[PDB]
Amino acid sequence: MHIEARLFEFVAAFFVVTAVLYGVLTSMFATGGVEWAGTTALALTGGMALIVATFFRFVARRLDSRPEDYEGAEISDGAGELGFFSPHSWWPIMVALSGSVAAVGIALWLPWLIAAGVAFILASAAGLVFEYYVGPEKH
Amino acid sequence: RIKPSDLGRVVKRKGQESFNFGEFFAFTKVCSHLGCPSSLYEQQSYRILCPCHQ
Amino acid sequence: ALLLIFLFWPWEFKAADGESDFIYSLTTPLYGLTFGLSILSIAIGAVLYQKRF
Amino acid sequence: SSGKYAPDLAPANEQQILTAMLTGPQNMPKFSNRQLSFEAKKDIIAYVKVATEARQPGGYLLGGFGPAPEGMAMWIIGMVAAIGLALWIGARS
Amino acid sequence: LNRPNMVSVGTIVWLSSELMFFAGLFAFYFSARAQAGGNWPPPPTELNLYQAVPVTLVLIASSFTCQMGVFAAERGDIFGLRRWYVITFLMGLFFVLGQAYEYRNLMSHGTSIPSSAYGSVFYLATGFHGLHVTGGLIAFIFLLVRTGMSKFTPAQATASIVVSYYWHFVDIVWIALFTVIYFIR
Amino acid sequence: ELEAIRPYPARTGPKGSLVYKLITTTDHKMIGIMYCVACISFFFIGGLLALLMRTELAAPGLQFLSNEQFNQLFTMHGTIMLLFYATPIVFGFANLVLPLQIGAPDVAFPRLNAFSFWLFVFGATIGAAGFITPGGAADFGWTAYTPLTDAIHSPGAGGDLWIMGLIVAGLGTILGAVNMITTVVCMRAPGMTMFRMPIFTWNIMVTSILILIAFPLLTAALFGLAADRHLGAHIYDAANGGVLLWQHLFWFFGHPEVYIIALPFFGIVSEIFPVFSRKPIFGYTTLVYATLSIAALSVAVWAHHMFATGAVLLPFFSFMTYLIAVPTGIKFFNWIGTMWKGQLTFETPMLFSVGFMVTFLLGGLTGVLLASPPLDFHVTDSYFVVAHFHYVLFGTIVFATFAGIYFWFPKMTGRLLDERLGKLHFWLTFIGFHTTFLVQHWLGDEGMPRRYADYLPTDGFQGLNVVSTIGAFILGASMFPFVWNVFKSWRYGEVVTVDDPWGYGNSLEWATSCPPPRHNFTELPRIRSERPAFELHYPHMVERLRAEAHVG
Amino acid sequence: MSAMEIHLFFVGIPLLLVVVLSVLIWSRKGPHPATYKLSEPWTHPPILWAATDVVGFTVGGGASGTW
Amino acid sequence: MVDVTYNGVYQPLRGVEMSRAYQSALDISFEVRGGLFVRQIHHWAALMFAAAIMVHLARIFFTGAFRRPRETNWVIGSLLLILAMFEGYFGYSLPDDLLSGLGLRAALSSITLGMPVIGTWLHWALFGGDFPGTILIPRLYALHILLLPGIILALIGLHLALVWFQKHTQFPGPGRTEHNVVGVRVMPVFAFKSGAFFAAIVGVLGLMGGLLQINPIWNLGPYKPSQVSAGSQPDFYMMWTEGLARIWPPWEFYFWHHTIPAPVWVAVIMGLVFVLLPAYPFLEKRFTGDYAHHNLLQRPRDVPVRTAIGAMAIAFYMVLTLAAMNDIIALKFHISLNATTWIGRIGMVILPPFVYFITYRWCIGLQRSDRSVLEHGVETGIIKRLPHGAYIELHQPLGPVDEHGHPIPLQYQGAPLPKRMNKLGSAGSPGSGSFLFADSAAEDAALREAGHAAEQRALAALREH
Amino acid sequence: ELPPGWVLTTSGRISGVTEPGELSVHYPFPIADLVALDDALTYSSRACQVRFAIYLGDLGRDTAARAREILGKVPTPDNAVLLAVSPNQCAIEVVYGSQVRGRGAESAAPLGVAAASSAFEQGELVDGLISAIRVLSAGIAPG
Ligand code: HEA
Ligand code: HEA
Ligand code: FES
Known part of the structure; x- marks a missing residue:
């Protein structure tokens, strides 16, 4: 994963270089001085890459060698139990329907329908969250 | 009162040629569909609308 | 609270634009809110007592 | 019918109300000062301003339409709360 | 198995996308600020410094309490986790x-x-921040409800941690916005 | 022996075997299939839109269409093509092959995939539903400049639906890219190394990186635009610098919106070359370096759409664009050197690839010609740039998409498409496309700027439009043979059960059964190079492969 | 113009090229082998087919024939 | 209906000629402490009644309890639905405002006068002459207070008595059979839950009545023949008749000095809809040739044909109802009125077969999924690496297991089965704390073991018996 | 011997490849004809609830012995009817199963054999097999 961190920090360095060069070149030789619009975007995308690389480095600096990170490893080294995966389910289509309703409401100005869409969004999120935690009925 | 500009696209229904008077027509109000009064008139489109069933 | 709001609330019509009433419009909503909350709390207590005892 | 509609009078101001009546805009019947008295315009604008700007003494308003939104509200709120309470009280088996 | 956690990287990239959303918002705000000379704020406007700082202190205290909740979280204690999260939720509601x-x-x-x-x-910049804070409160409620309905697993701790540093990111962007607005002016 | 087998597999299967499975799905493969179907349908809608266009444009004068309808018409055509076909087809190929390419049993977030798919479908349905409005949909072009998109002009409901559809599609794309990044980074084969995966994975992950970099800015921009349209927030008023600001941000978002739709299909052609060339990929690490260089610099060249405004610094962005031109040439050189001195066999996929490189070559020449500021000062907004982006976009996307479909159809369905109909389709599409989109240079450099509803008989070019219409009509009917072939071969046609119908395959994909069961795996071979299935099927060729790996 | 003498080009140009390509390509030979002839010996290896529809060595009959 | 002057308290309505009943309604709404609240509760409760009866009829139709033992109950229910719908139609007409006046005028006058043979006789008998009569409103008031409510109450009592004597059905389950009933006794549970539900329904009615304004007659005006506007679309439980009137094409017949108008077809359609509702069980029993008793219902996914016909009917009703709301559709959403009318007209014919086929396929797919989950263990959502290189689902068997570890196939008994691991007891019941402080470990362990023992004992008693 | 392109995997499954320009069936029969015979076979097997198999190889030995030896390869030999045709030696045979007895098996072999033989002199074999399978399926009654 160290390769991914190196790539991310290279991207961060490139973004920082581009941002600082654009800022210094727009300070002078400009009709309107500082552009003040693209400079912010470049600066914060560089900051994004910086924080992502920092998080990856913090993860890398406190982790052991995984079989995929070790070339020449054998298949039985990775043998074990993987994470949990959701089988057949249907909540996401209902969540998407609620989101579409909310989008339609915020399209044409009808506050009642946007409130209904927000309520449906909350209900769909609640249904999604509890799909794998509700136990047997207490009866 | 119809606009005197056109006065040329009227039809003068077969038995009521002389009923009209210049810029006057004097149509009734009770719609023949169900009896709902129709009071929705557009001057530019010359269309009368019945609100009960469009 | 419902008893108090029924006894001592201004319910005579004064709605206009010369004076900001902001209260005459709040008689029926207050009545309904108090009534529904009271009896709904009673029902919730009853069902919880049944389901846990 | 066929496209154009009737706008809401909520964003209307009285001078423009009188002027719009007297002008006869698109799809609207033009009104002359001869057929309607000036006192009639004053009364009309007074009623228009009173009706919309007065607080409804029946709680939250539902758009001023007929009972179709009322039925929609019944189906979306009363039904949902009722079936939720039924499921809470009842059991599934 | 699974030395890293996919929820962690997913939340990291999601917060990155939201950070670029706030980048767009900052781009909207800083634009046309220099277009007005002298008193570029309108006179019919005067920020209340005596009220803005307290909410910032509230948010930083909530973030510290959330970190304490995390420290309770990596070990086997759910009740202290719930207490810290409730304190943070009340602080954010205030x-x-x-x-x-x-x-x-x-x-x-x-x-x-x-x-x-x-x-x-200013209203546009603050409205999205308020909406995201409300979403964070909703996430707090959902997560705390989920804790008490079943057994404790590392997935619950992962969800708590990701929500925690999402809140920390919210605190960071809020303090950055506050420094931009009330101090630099 | 004498194993008992059916004469044919089930044609359609048992009754009711698709609906509920589609609704309650969790499989990435069928999600990609639905992506492909939706892309094909939207491609059809936009294609009939464009045919109506080209039949109206010919025969100078207004025959049967009005100006505002024409304006709404190119708004919808451009929007549908740019943001409802290519972006979903990217995630379609993602869901089809990326978990299969890496070897992962499943995606990271199966729920999120269906969430994104349904969100995109709903957003497309809402946005495209602007034709039912009596006032119609939005009238401004897909550029959506500052002053025409406010409340004062275009006050119809179409603009709101357009904006909300774009918002929903962007959110779905963001979630899909997040899913792809998480799946690639977290899950992998146990013996798999990041320096051994096919180039398509590198292209898709840099593409997702660019997605996450670019898309949220559009969300903020459209939120601000909706706020202006519904509340009058004075954000984009002419009294302020909003005219430049909105253009800057919108182009900064949209130029990566076309750079994202090139790398994955470059990877597709890169992985389709070796199987027919019987040679290893050329400049592997060099290809990765060039992909990274394209991905990084694909974001700092946005201002080269501002030449006509005359308020930005020219030479810096000109130099940046001329720098970004080189890595595309490096990719092309790698591709052409891959197939040099090989046993190339002419089938439908490589013929589509040949057409792809031809069209992309011509488009790249036009683009590198376009980069000159003084040249753009005369040729901008003319049909020249129209031919430019038509060439590049169509030649990459349509050709590579059809080639990849022809390639991986047996992997998804276990059936092989006919080659005669494929050859006829390729020839007819190629002929129509170079016939209808070649002359617009001649029409464009002379006075005839884009998006015109009419012109005058006094000017010439009364026959060039006729030739363009003839070619466009020819291209319109070229899709029908492909549809008939696909529909016939879905149930009927040759059935392949032996692995890798196209022998000498690579990319680890040809080591499993042609009809892939759930979780996609029952065995795993050794991982020693970037051609594991090739070594597995021909173990006696390893020594030779390792011996002459650096002859040059 | 809407004249038929010039609409003839727009109508017939695609059809003639479609016909030419069809007679050039479709008239060629597919990879499907020809039908087995009874006079020709059964050079194909032995083959059996099973319905495999019902889901769940002793012999109780027989037959013979010589055409 | 004698004309009077208001001269009350509502200033914008002073000095206007008006009907006495409208004045009394205004008095109830404005000059009595809380009268508006009570009338709003009444109207909301009537809508509650209509929606509840519709939902109950739908559930009865889906469960298929309308077989031989209880056919007369179905006929009585159809009569109840028709009478309640007519009573509800008569409800909103007593305060004769513009909306109610227009609705009653249109419906009653046009339909009654449009009768081919009798026609004018019925209208003149009902109104006492022309349409606007001095006796119409008192007659409607009397019919709304006395005849229909009493008949409805008597018939409801009859239906309750019939369902009391003939024992209620039950869903299939572990300890359920066609010769016994599983449930709870009256004293400790049944009556208490009924009272709690009654209190809760009164609560929701009161809350939503106090929050939502309904039928603001004061905003309207007194009924006059010359006033009319877009105000239309009466109460939503007879709205289908209005939609049918709207969408019907204008076909007419002219023979010797006579004319039959279009709405006669609407009358024929509504009469046939009335006729078909009680006649359905006879048609089913003489079509399928089944004459067997049944005390056990069938889950909806088991019978495809009946579910398909139900989807047919509900889709037809929904498309007809939404057609009548055309004006609001074109207003809130900028759509052409004519386009929406044409859409409804064409959809009334083209939509039904599509949804019929779709729901048939849906039911078949549900049956297939149930068979599949019967064949193998329910999916646990866990995969294993299998160092030799495979991936397995690790199904959790629901019962007997063979020598190979693959559970032997079970049999379908029409009983629901869990589709998620958390539905069955796997890992639950966390610590004994309330919300912030845990309890003693011994108490939590004792509670856990007691609950497990109680649930196991209940399950064993139900399964064995 | 693991033909080039086929390699044994870790498990018992065999992974095999083929040159792109060739097929993987090599059946000298029309596609529509094979589809029709498969449809007839399926729609007869579902009704009769008895497995039916067709063999087109050579039986240059005791035809009855070879035919009864082949029947063991049926997934359910106890309930199955096998029809074998040897075009080189003109051998047509039909055999029964243990469970499929007394269900019209005896009253079906002569009719099906006669139909197939009569349909084999005009040069076609597939329509003859279809006719034989149809007539024997009609003869076979469930039980
Ligand atoms: C898939 C979509 C796509 C792709 C791949 C491209 C690829 C390129 N584009 Fe294009 N472009 C668009 C879609 C695309 N474009 C769209 C939609 C617009 C405007 C939309 C609107 O405004 O309406 C646009 C507008 C646009 C403009 C401004 C036009 C205008 O606003 O007036 C310019 C000029 O700077 C430009 C240049 C390029 C260049 C240099 C490339 C290069 O990537 C391609 C060059 C590739 C080559 C093959 C060269 C490879 C190198 C060699 C082979 C070595 C030798 C080369 C040299 C001679 C140096 N594009
Ligand atoms: C991927 C993107 C993409 C694709 C694939 C296409 C495909 C085509 N385009 Fe489009 N086009 C654009 C993107 C694309 N276009 C963009 C971005 C612009 C300008 C943006 C702007 O200026 O706003 C543009 C503009 C544009 C114009 C000029 C518009 C203007 O200046 O006014 C023209 C006409 O000259 C044209 C023609 C075509 C043709 C003939 C095809 C053909 O390739 C299409 C062939 C397809 C078919 C025709 C389908 C077959 C149709 C039927 C047979 C359906 C019948 C069946 C049913 C009844 C269900 N395009
Ligand atoms: S009375 Fe005219 S539409 Fe009904």
């Missing part, structure tokens, strides 16, 4: 009421969304 009161005060004295450009950009 904050939210704070900017609601500030909102009520501001519009009552002139400046509104359609009034001036500065008012519009």
Whole structure:
């Protein structure tokens, strides 16, 4: 994963270089001085890459060698139990329907329908969250 | 009162040629569909609308 | 609270634009809110007592 | 019918109300000062301003339409709360 | 198995996308700020310094309590986790009421969304932050409800941690915005 | 022996075997299939839109269409093509092959995939539903400049639906890219190394990186635009610098919106070359370096759409664009050197690839010609740039998409498409496309700027439009043979059960059964190079492969 | 113009090229082998087919024939 | 109906000629402490009644309890639905405002006068002459207070008595059979839950009545023949008749000095809809040739044909109802009125077969999924690496297991089965704390073991018996 | 011997490849004809609830012995009817199963054999097999 961190920090360095060069070149030789619009975007995308690389480095600096990170490893080294995966389910289509309703409401100005869409969004999120935690009925 | 500009696209229904008077027509109000009064008139489109069933 | 709001609330019509009433419009909503909350709390207590005892 | 509609009078101001009546805009019947008295315009604008700007003494308003939104509200709120309470009280088996 | 956690990287990239959303918002705000000379804020506007700092202190205290909840979280204790999360939720609710009161005060004295450009950009910048704070409160409620309905697993701890540094990111962007607005001016 | 087998597999299967499975799905493969179907349908809608266009444009004068309808018409055509076909087809190929390419049993977030798919479908349905409005949909072009998109002009409901559809599609794309990044980074084969995966994975992950970099800015921009349209927030008023600001941000978002739709299909052609060339990929690490260089610099060249405004610094962005031109040439050189001195066999996929490189070559020449500021000062907004982006976009996307479909159809369905109909389709599409989109240079450099509803008989070019219409009509009917072939071969046609119908395959994909069961795996071979299935099927060729790996 | 003498080009140009390509390509030979002839010996290896529809060595009959 | 002057308290309505009943309604709404609240509660409760009866009829139709033992109950229910719908139609007409006046005028006058043979006789008998009569409103008031409510109450009592004597059905389950009933006794549970539900329904009615304004007659005006506007679309439980009137094409017949108008077809359609509702069980029993008793219902996914016909009917009703709301559709959403009318007209014919086929396929797919989950263990959502290189689902068997570890196939008994691991007891019941402080470990362990023992004992008693 | 392109995997499954320009069936029969015979076979097997198999190889030995030896390869030999045709030696045979007895098996072999033989002199074999399978399926009654 160290390769991914190196790539991310290279991207961060490139973004920082581009941002600082654009800022210094727009300070002078400009009709309107500082552009003040693209400079912010470049600066914060560089900051994004910086924080992502920092998080990856913090993860890398406190982790052991995984079989995929070790070339020449054998298949039985990775043998074990993987994470949990959701089988057949249907909540996401209902969540998407609620989101579409909310989008339609915020399209044409009808506050009642946007409130209904927000309520449906909350209900769909609640249904999604509890799909794998509700136990047997207490009866 | 119809606009005197056109006065040329009227039809003068077969038995009521002389009923009209210049810029006057004097149509009734009770719609023949169900009896709902129709009071929705557009001057530019010359269309009368019945609100009960469009 | 419902008893108090029924006894001592201004319910005579004064709605206009010369004076900001902001209260005459709040008689029926207050009545309904108090009534529904009271009896709904009673029902919730009853069902919880049944389901846990 | 066929496209154009009737706008809401909520964003209307009285001078423009009188002027719009007297002008006869698109799809609207033009009104002359001869057929309607000036006192009639004053009364009309007074009623228009009173009706919309007065607080409804029946709680939250539902758009001023007929009972179709009322039925929609019944189906979306009363039904949902009722079936939720039924499921809470009842059991599934 | 699974030395890293996919939820961690997913939340990291999601917060990255939201950080670029706030980048766009900052781009909207900083634009046209220099277009007005001298007193570029409209006179019918005066920020209340005596009320803005307390909500910032509220949010940083909530973030510290959330970190304490995390420290309780990596070990086997759910009840202290719930206590810390409830404290953070109450602190954030007090904050939210704070900017609601500030909102009520501001519009009552002139400046509104359609009034001036500065008012519009400030309102737009603060509204998304308020909405995201409310979403964070909703996430707190959902997560705390999920804790008490079943057994404790590392997935619950992962969800708590990701929500925690999402809140920390919210705190960081809020303090950055506050420094931009009330100090640099 | 004498194993008992059916004469044919089930044609359609048992009744009711698709609906509920589609609704309650969790499989990435069928999600990609639905992506492909939706892309094909939207491609059809936009294609009939464009045919109506080209039949109206010919025969100078207004025959049967009005100006505002024409304006709404190119708004919808451009929007549908740019943001409802290519972006979903990217995630379609993602869901089809990326978990299969890496070897992962499943995606990271199966729920999120269906969430994104349904969100995109709903957003497309809402946005495209602007034709039912009596006032119609939005009238401004897909550029959506500052002053025409406010409340004062275009006050119809179409703009709101357009904006909300774009918002929903962007959110779905963001979630899909997040899913792809998480799946690639977290899950992998146990013996798998990041320096051994096919180039398509590198292209898709840099593409997702660019997605996450670019898309949220559009969300903020459209939120601000909706706020202006519904509340009058004075954000984009002419009294302020919003005219430049909105253009800057929108182009900064949209130029990566076309750079994202090139790398994955470059990877597709890169992985389709070796199987027919019987040679290893050329400049592997060099290809990765060039992909990274394209991905990084694909974001700092946005201002080269501002030449006509005359308020930005020219030479810096000109130099940046001329720098970004080189890595595309490096990719092309790698591709052409891959197939040099090989046993190339002419089938439908490589013929589509040949057409792809031809069209992309011509488009790249036009683009590198376009980069000159003084040249753009005369040729901008003319049909020249129209031919430019038509060439590049169509030649990459349509050709590579059809080639990849022809390639991986047996992997998804276990059936092989006919080659005669494929050859006829390729020839007819190629002929129509170079016939209808060649002359617009001649029409464009002379006075005839884009998006015109009419012109005058006094000017010439009364026959060039006729030739363009003839070619466009020819291209319109070229899709029908492909549809008939696909529909016939879905149930009927040759059935392949032996692995890798196209022998000498690579990319680890040809080591499993042609009809892939759930979780996609029952065995795993050794991982020693970037051609594991090739070594597995021909173990006696390893020594030779390792011996002459650096002859040059 | 809407004249038929010039609409003839727009109508017939695609059809003639479609016909030419069809007679050039479709008239060629597919990879499907020809039908087995009874006079020709059964050079194909032995083959059996099973319905495999019902889901769940002793012999109780027989037959013979010589055409 | 004698004309009077208001001269009350509502200033914008002073000095206007008006009907006495409208004045009394205004008095109830404005000059009595809380009268508006009570009338709003009444109207909201009537809508509650209509929606509840519709939902109950739908559930009865889906469960298929309308077989031989209880056919007369179905006929009585159809009569109840028709009478309640007519009573509800008569409800909103007593305060004769513009909306109610227009609705009653249109419906009653046009339909009654449009009768081919009798026609004018019925209208003149009902109104006492022309349409606007001095006796119409008192007659409607009397019919709304006395005849229909009493008949409805008596018939409801009859239906309750019939369902009391003939024992209620039950869903299939572990300890359920066609010769016994599983449930709870009256004293400790049944009556208490009924009272709690009654209190809760009164609560929701009161809350939503106090929050939502309904039928603001004061905003309207007194009924006059010359006033009319877009105000239309009466109460939503007879709205289908209005939609049918709207969408019907204008076909007419002209023979010797006579004319039959279009709405006669609407009358024929509504009469046939009335006729078909009680006649359905006879048609089913003489079509399928089944004459067997049944005390056990069938889950909806088991019978495809009946579910398909139900989807047919509900889709037809929904498309007809939404057609009548055309004006609001074109207003809130900028759509052409004519386009929406044409859409409804064409959809009334083209939509039904599509949804019929779709729901048939849906039911078949549900049956297939149930068979599949019967064949193998329910999916646990866990995969294993299998160092030799495979991936397995690790199904959790629901019962007997063979020598190979693959559970032997079970049999379908029409009983629901869990589709998620958390539905069955796997890992639950966390610590004994309330919300912030845990309890003693011994108490939590004792509670856990007691609950497990109680649930196991209940399950064993139900399964064995 | 693991033909080039086929390699044994870790498990018992065999992974095999083929040159792109060739097929993987090599059946000298029309596609539509094979589809029709498969449809007839399926729609007869579902009704009769008895497995039916067709063999087109050579039986240059005791035809009855070879035919009864082949029947063991049926997934359910106890309930199955096998029809074998040897075009080189003109051998047509039909055999029964243990469970499929007394269900019209005896009253079906002569009719099906006669139909197939009569349909084999005009040069076609597939329609003859279809006719034989149809007539024997009609003869076979469930039980
Ligand atoms: C898939 C979509 C796509 C792709 C791949 C491209 C690829 C390129 N584009 Fe294009 N472009 C668009 C879609 C695309 N474009 C769209 C939609 C617009 C405007 C939309 C609107 O405004 O309406 C646009 C507008 C546009 C403009 C401004 C036009 C205008 O606003 O007036 C310019 C000029 O700077 C430009 C240049 C390029 C260049 C240099 C490339 C290069 O990537 C391609 C060059 C590739 C080559 C093959 C060269 C490879 C190198 C060699 C082979 C070595 C030798 C080369 C040299 C001679 C140096 N594009
Ligand atoms: C991927 C993107 C993409 C694709 C694939 C296409 C495909 C085509 N385009 Fe389009 N086009 C654009 C993107 C694309 N276009 C963009 C971005 C612009 C300008 C943006 C702007 O200026 O706003 C543009 C503009 C544009 C114009 C000029 C518009 C203007 O200046 O006014 C023209 C006409 O000259 C044209 C023609 C075509 C043709 C003939 C095809 C053909 O390739 C299409 C062939 C397809 C078919 C025709 C389908 C077959 C149709 C039927 C047979 C359906 C019948 C069946 C049913 C009844 C269900 N395009
Ligand atoms: S009375 Fe005219 S539409 Fe009904």
